[PDB]
């Protein structure tokens, strides 16, 4: 009868931002003051809702989106943001309702030789709609000649590796981000505050 946020936050593996993972939360009581208890959070920002009223609100569904990005890219996981992540990887709506949670994960996602396993999308023909997910690998046509699925000049693989080394600057270090989107529809509520 208590929402298992630990499956999301205390998970051992995190998705790349371009293939960001989503988990649904329902049929439980969400005590956000207990979630805010982890003093390890470098970012805990809620939008469209008052953080103190969180334990007094009900919603139709709550979604937990989790992924990994750079340090100085957490600023893009917010409504109205632009950049490689907000345009091509993960996009929140203007009228977003939920919280953005993030913490430095340099000890987990960095290797001394360099961890390049976390990916992101670098090019895309158009920006992402809110909560749109693109895991395609179409050869991006940067020039005017078609690519026909062949990499070459002005025909680039759309994905790119990050490169997390423990001796990087804090803005190039891996951060893990959880977004708790709160959804209100004409359906019975499944998540409430205590």
């Amino acid at each position, epitope marked *: 009868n208590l929402c298992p946020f630990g499956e999301v936050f205390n998970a051992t593996r995190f998705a790349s931002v371009y293939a960001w993972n989503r988990k649904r939360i329902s049929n439980c009581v969400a005590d956000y003051s207990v979630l805010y208890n982890s003093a390890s959070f470098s970012t805990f920002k809620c939008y469209g809702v008052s953080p103190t009223k969180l334990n007094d609100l009900c919603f139709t569904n709550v979604y937990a989106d989790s992924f990994v990005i750079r340090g100085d890219e957490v600023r893009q996981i917010a409504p109205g943001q632009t950049g490689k992540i907000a345009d091509y990887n993960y996009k929140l709506p203007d009228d977003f309702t939920g919280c953005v949670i993030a913490w430095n994960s340099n000890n987990l996602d960095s*290797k001394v*030789g*360099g*961890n*390049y*396993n976390y*990916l992101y999308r*670098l090019f895309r023909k158009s920006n992402l709609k809110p909560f749109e997910r693109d895991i395609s*690998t179409e050869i991006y046509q940067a020039g005017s000649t078609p690519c026909n699925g062949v*990499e*070459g*000049f*002005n*025909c*680039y*693989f759309p*994905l*790119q*590796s990050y*490169g997390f080394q423990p001796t990087n600057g804090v803005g190039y270090q891996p951060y893990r981000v959880v977004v708790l989107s709160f959804e209100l529809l004409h359906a019975p509520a499944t998540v409430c505050g205590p």
Partner: nanobody
Amino acid sequence: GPQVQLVESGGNLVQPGGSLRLSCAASGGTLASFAVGWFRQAPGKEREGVSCIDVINRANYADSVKGRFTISRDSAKNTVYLQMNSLEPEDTAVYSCAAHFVPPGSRLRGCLVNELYNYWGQGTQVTVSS
């Protein structure tokens, strides 16, 4: 595969005038983030770069293999190929793969002037003999 690793394939004993395609399958990341260069070490001679390719897929070749070799990229298989045509006995060597990362801003690391690579495969042997 937490660390980046390269593995070469395609080596074989071939005849003069024959052709081979060597593969460089990478692991632990997108090879499309990396400059890839091919090298060969013949017995008794020094290690010699033969072909490389930028992250924007610009190619360059040593003068000793120009017009005969073709480097190409297939990042869908995390692989960079090397097509070798009109093989002569002087091509007999251990052909090894090499990679080094290119940050998105510094999108010029890769040209054969950047011949200091960080990751290396074990090499595959190509023997050209009648």
